[PDB]
Design a protein around this ligand. Structure first.
Ligand code: FAD
Ligand code: FAD
Ligand code: FAD
Ligand code: TPP
Ligand code: TPP
Ligand code: TPP
Ligand code: MG
Ligand code: MG
Ligand code: MG
Lengths: 577, 577, 577
């Protein structure tokens, strides 16, 4: 007979898990012994928070289960930031939360916590093992819940019970459902959407991450009804590239004509998006297609709700949607889009290649050009989100992106890159780090060195909490607490045994970044950038930066955009005569 | 400008809510004033627990939102049993939990509780209002969550904030998605199910509540592959009637050949069921079709998982499923089914019409014959669940049933009947009450009298917690705490102003129950029944009654069955020669 | 070897527990079998909510542990209202929450709930048993926590584990600390209070339940510094009787000069009170003595905080407090107090003995005169709280009182009386019931009959939610939802086998109530009272009734007072010349 720890690891191995991220100790020793004897690799991190980020990033890249593990009490407590992030991102993650010995539960014991209560908000399933047999059962339920799309699962395992005898295999013997059902809409909701589209003279589509598997259908619908296509940040990687109807992104980090096209069309269709900034959304005549009905109408007035998959809904309605031959609205919005992008480049990035200290938008433009066509980019929360949104492209859809776009935590970039890089050491992974984010989990440079992960950590080092400095400028409150003395991350990385370079001259950015990106190993690129590069229209308020101003707005943060302008201009040249 | 209380009630009225069940007080006075001025009826109950049961039953009958409401602190605390029941039953219920004044939150004030924390387990959405505008928003989110099938929603409203100004209408103006999407399976999961069916020589279908809208498809599949059809208790009302393949129900309250057909077939297919008694389920070769992937494999080994709707999955696979011409397995199971039903009638209900005290199975047989073809039956948890399962039929599918089949609470029958009867006073509603259940919420007889609800409360009065007496007999522990001195519910009902009859002679059951069921008003029927009528095989253990014995079993509680035997016998006579 | 169920009951028996209140079923059968074999009596209730109220009332009367018990899932869910009440009242209660079988936890099983999470707010200790040995340990910890004054303890016991082997006795062998430590104040805080008293020319003491064991010390301090003594409702039973400095109670149910004496004195001292209605409390110069430092300053500005016991603090300061020879303030407040009480009697209860329907204040005056000198009174939340506060006296301190004065739940009176009466069947127990409260848990009349508890249920039957009708009159909102058709509780009680009388003529109240109170058995007294008897000053607002108006007030609800005026008048006649 095997123990429950051995059955746990055999079940994960049989499901194809290749790695577990974590930090060993106490109630986790029987589980780590079983890992040693299996083909699963143990990936040691310095802070268990990084293990939960790394597992979430691995799962977003692979589309499969990923796993993190931590010791009792304080050990598993450290998972929590990464579990919130993974849960909000819809990752397929199992967290093994080792727990104090069962006989000491309820006695205010050394290290006691109640993880089975603490992790309820950052999980779709979270239960405690109380015996080997029941442990097999709740491991199945946890894996089946996360694979069905319910978000993070936590299994809480008192250390003693991991050494108890395994269950009889009834539940570990099951095949897990990991398929993708095809969700067609209710015919009554679909018919109301057809009527709304056919009655409208102009339509705009606004897409989010829910169009990941619906590019062909969204483009086919747009060609038929001559609709501009805008996106939320979660839709950018899927719908912006090679899109003849492209009109940009809404929100403060937005760009182009998206806000105007969304608000001026007779009908706006929200496709697979939960974009939260309601002040940028119209209310007059909006449809929304979402696979989770509970999300419909969360962000603005929706008159035509449709619970359904985007691709299946468009396939179902298309034969009933009339072709629109008038593309005057689309042409006006494509022209306004290109004019707006050209205008922000002229206003904000004139001679940006000579700006000192180095302008982060110059770095981001060069990074987009130099990085591989299939690189993974990870994005630290803060001003790196602006540089990703406005400069990092996805030609042919072959790059991947991982960030904290929903939970919005700092310090995610380097741990996300550790997980993404572990999937395939031959694929380039670029972590766009802030100095605040990197400092917050600095010890994970020791993890990169230990595992020899050949990721490229690009530090936008401006010695400032740049996004907070923006929020304070916008509020009109004296700058305080954001900027501190400079740190030399290249020297810290070199002291940790990582190849590094420090870039201070804009004239050497292109050559030094090309050399670093081509280095066959881990490398940290410490770029000293301008802390005052973020430009802000004086009319933006702290209530808008914080997201609680409901009054209609079309204003975005200042700054330029990058290579997205090439598609905007080819779309103008291809407008039918 | 309106207040938030007025906007709350206008939004519910615009959505078609006709009634709110509750008990007025304190922070709920502004909301009740708005109800008075609207077309919504206030249905006063004596204990707010009954309001939450009544709302859950109303929604199960109508398929639409139902609403309950209660005052701060202790008032809304009383909702909780009915919210768990409604939530487990998948009802579409909004609970308005009035709360203490916002300025006193956090001060250990008079009546203070934290309902926004307490009701997390019995809801899919539960949040606190902190201003009129945000209150409009979370009311929308709560209604959209319950209408999308996520279970109960709770909106917690500090009393003072109900008098604050209303939001601007952005969220109340939305149309709620209440449609039913059509969920086809992933083609890879569907193809594996086709291969399993075509490889199997014999197949049995085991259906639950998830086949509600798939009768035609289940029967078409059964005719093609010659499969017996069994059911869980939640499937009985939908699949047993007019079913040429009928083989009964599994579990301790089960009957017929279902356990044998499910365990002897080469392949068992679980269709829309989460039947929890794993010791009755095989493990060797099982498929499961469920619309919620997280439920697959919860109860036994599943080798062919399919996330999908039952009807859409069967429609998709049918052209690829080969017709089976050999119906030897089906014929053997139909013959065994009828033999087993005839045997339990001969063993347990010989001369049952002369048994004294009155046998509850004699009452249940007469109640099935006399009740209307479209009656609603509500079923009190306990031995009434056995009498429903084995005696109350659903010819042509026109009756409806409400019970606590998942949460398993006592005392639900009379409050469920209050909600079901409020939907249509011209429809017959029969509450199958136990003396324990009725005593537990006895004050709701005052509610029946106040609202003149013409329901028929049939009390199986055996002065005993009959199901607990069974559990103790099965364990082999001396009877204690279950049986107490007799109560005259007919005299209590008459003292409350309700028409009543007391039935003690088996020779008068048919005439007295016919007269009472035909009474044009509320009526309580107090039937003095035999507390020792539940027969138990000595091999049943307390571990089996409690549901924690995993060893394979086919043993059911003793007792007979009713009119279901007529279909069993016609199915034998129609077996092709 | 014994089982954990047997060890649980042996441990309670060894600690002196005489009874357990509850309702048998499932996971509780092994525990009830152990009770049968012990000397503990099982007290069957009809709804487990009543068991938790009865245990809380028993403990308040005895000063010892009391116990309630309920079955898994829905069974223990029903305890919750009574656990909140017992917890807020500081009762010493163990709740045995039977739970689903451990192997099914986490599987969404039949009846599954998580009581170990649900009951966190209504308990000081709440943990789950996961084995027999750890179960012995957390039973000790639960008993020691409640006996040390931390409020309710809940032990959650999966049914299967109750049959597991008992622990080794290490923790059940301990003696529980149930002593009362003597908490002297910090000398620095005490010296600041001495300076405040000696600097003040006039002082008023305002006492709550924390003066229970400090009557002699409070009176000695008042004689020395010539201070009026007022009380919160929780202090009334301890400090009003035979008090030469008595000036009444504050709050809307208040009376006499208390609000004026508290606000006009140079120094107000809060002694053992957490009175929550801040608009009645001054802010200028207030001291507060409380044994729980976290409570100091919860309700108004406190300049002289003292963490300490009332009696020990007064004993410590008394030698340093200077005698005040000027009693002009005390004399002015004693005269104003008696004038105010005489005025409300003249305004509101002129010829009250002839008022029809019967006036509840006439009933309350007669009930105070006729009830025994050592009776227990239980008080249903609602208008019965006004009648208790203004009419039920405690001469020589020999009566006891139980109510829901902090949690404020309806329906507590009859279940509180069941627990208080079970302590000593020879002691008179009077339940002051409202028709709303009694209807809410009406089935507990069957409990009174079953156990032959000789309590006297006095129903103030006005067919109205009287306190809510007051709140609506005060708000100026049309009356709705409070008054319904009349119920005959005397006929319902007689149908339940309880002696009853229906009183409708004011001329027969005294004789019929005297006869009923002297009946040697259970009796229900259904008094048809005037629903419009509660008088309200038009200046009271719904914000004041709800407790969120902070503006200074001295206004109380209209109505008269009773025999308290005799002490007010003797105190005037004894003012030194
Ligand atoms: C510092 C910072 C600033 C930010 N600023 C902005 C900004 O200015 N602009 C911006 O756009 N974002 C911004 N974001 C991100 C923003 O908060 C949201 O996370 C993002 O807009 C949501 O993108 P989304 O709608 O694509 O994804 P989600 O919020 O994940 O929504 C996806 C939706 O698709 C649905 N869905 C999934 N699959 C399907 C399917 N097959 N069919 C149908 N529906 C489906 C889901 O149910 C869900 O409702 C910022 C983030 C950070 C960290
Ligand atoms: C005292 C008592 C005794 C009991 N004894 C028994 C007994 O002996 N036998 C018994 O059978 N029950 C018994 N029960 C009830 C039992 O506990 C379960 O509640 C019941 O078996 C579950 O029935 P079900 O599977 O139909 O419903 P559910 O548990 O509600 O499961 C329905 C399933 O269908 C799925 N679904 C819903 N819609 C669709 C769709 N369109 N397509 C696909 N899937 C869908 C759901 O996701 C879910 O998994 C008892 C109850 C009581 C109160
Ligand atoms: C419908 C209704 C209306 C009400 N209206 C009123 C009203 O108008 N007026 C009114 O007064 N009440 C009213 N109440 C009750 C009110 O809400 C409070 O519960 C009550 O005033 C508190 O009384 P208390 O301060 O004595 O008790 P508690 O709130 O229990 O406070 C006792 C304090 O004493 C402290 N303490 C305990 N022992 C010691 C010790 N040995 N030494 C020192 N400190 C100690 C405790 O830590 C605590 O802070 C009403 C109740 C109801 C149900
Ligand atoms: C753990 C955490 N702390 C604080 C914040 C708030 N926050 C959001 S962005 C930001 C600054 C991020 O700093 P850095 O990584 O240097 O990037 P910058 O904005 O300068 O690019 C801060 C403080 C956060 N979301 N997460
Ligand atoms: C609130 C609650 N308390 C206890 C139980 C446990 N229980 C389940 S069935 C049963 C007896 C039900 O009694 P009654 O209504 O008289 O029906 P009977 O079994 O006699 O038909 C009990 C105690 C429950 N599930 N719910
Ligand atoms: C469970 C519960 N529901 C509602 C309330 C609100 N409430 C407080 S007093 C009151 C009326 C009490 O009625 P009754 O027992 O008839 O006494 P009355 O005020 O008429 O004397 C109500 C509705 C409460 N606190 N508890
Ligand atoms: Mg920075
Ligand atoms: Mg019974
Ligand atoms: Mg009343």
């Amino acid at each position: 007979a095997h123990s429950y720890a051995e059955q746990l690891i055999d079940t994960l191995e049989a499901q194809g898990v290749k790695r577990i991220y974590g930090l060993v100790g106490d109630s986790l020793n029987p589980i780590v012994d079983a890992v040693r004897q299996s083909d699963i690799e143990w990936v040691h991190v310095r802070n268990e928070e990084a293990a939960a980020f790394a597992a979430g990033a691995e799962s977003l890249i692979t589309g499969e289960l990923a796993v993190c593990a931590a010791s009792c009490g304080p050990g598993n407590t450290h998972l929590i930031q990464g579990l919130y992030d993974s849960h909000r991102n819809g990752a397929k993650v199992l967290a093994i939360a080792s727990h104090i010995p069962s006989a000491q539960i309820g006695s205010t014991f050394f290290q006691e916590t109640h993880p089975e209560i603490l992790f309820k908000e950052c999980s779709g399933y979270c239960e405690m093992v109380n015996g080997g047999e029941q442990g097999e059962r709740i491991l199945h339920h946890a894996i089946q819940s996360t694979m069905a799309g319910k978000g993070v699962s936590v299994v809480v395992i008192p250390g003693d019970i991991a050494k108890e005898d395994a269950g009889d295999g009834t539940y570990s013997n099951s095949t897990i459902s990991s398929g993708t059902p095809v969700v067609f809409p209710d015919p009554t909701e679909a018919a109301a959407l057809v009527e709304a589209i056919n009655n409208a003279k102009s339509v705009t589509l606004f897409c989010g991450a829910g169009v990941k598997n619906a590019r062909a259908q969204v483009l086919e619908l747009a060609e038929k009804i001559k609709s501009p296509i805008g996106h939320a940040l979660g839709g950018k990687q899927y719908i912006q590239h090679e899109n003849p109807f492209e009109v940009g992104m809404s929100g403060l980090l937005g760009y182009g004509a998206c806000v105007d096209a969304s608000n001026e069309a007779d009908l706006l269709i929200l496709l697979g998006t939960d974009f939260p900034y309601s002040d940028f959304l119209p209310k007059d005549n909006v449809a929304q297609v979402d696979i989770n009905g509970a999300h419909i109408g969360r962000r603005t007035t929706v008159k035509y709700p449709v619970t359904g998959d985007v691709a299946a809904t468009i396939e179902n309605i298309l034969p009933h949607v009339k072709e629109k031959t008038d593309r005057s609205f689309l042409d006006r919005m494509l022209k306004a889009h290109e004019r707006k992008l050209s205008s922000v480049v002229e206003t904000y990035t004139h001679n940006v290649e000579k700006h000192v200290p180095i302008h982060p938008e110059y770095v981001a433009s060069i990074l987009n050009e130099l990085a591989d066509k299939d690189a993974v980019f990870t994005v630290d929360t803060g001003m790196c989100n602006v540089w990703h949104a406005r400069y990092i492209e996805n030609p042919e859809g072959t790059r991947d992106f991982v960030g904290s776009f929903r939970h919005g935590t700092m310090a995610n970039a380097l741990p996300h890159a550790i997980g993404a890089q572990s999937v395939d050491r031959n694929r380039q992974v670029i972590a766009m780090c802030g100095d605040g984010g990197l400092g917050m989990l600095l010890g994970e440079l020791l993890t990169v060195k230990l595992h020899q992960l050949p990721l490229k950590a690009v530090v936008f080092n401006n010695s400032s909490l740049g996004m907070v400095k923006l929020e304070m400028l916008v509020e009109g409150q004296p700058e305080f607490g954001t900027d501190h003395e400079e740190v030399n991350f290249a020297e810290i990385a070199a002291a940790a045994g990582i190849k590094s370079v420090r870039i201070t001259d804009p004239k050497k950015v292109r050559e030094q970044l090309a050399e670093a990106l081509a280095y066959p190993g881990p490398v940290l690129i410490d770029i000293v950038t301008d802390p005052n590069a973020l430009s802000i229209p004086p009319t933006i308020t702290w209530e808008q930066v914080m997201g609680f101003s409901k009054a209609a707005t079309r204003t975005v943060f200042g700054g330029g955009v990058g290579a997205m302008i090439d598609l905007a201009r080819s779309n103008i040249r291809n407008i039918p005569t």
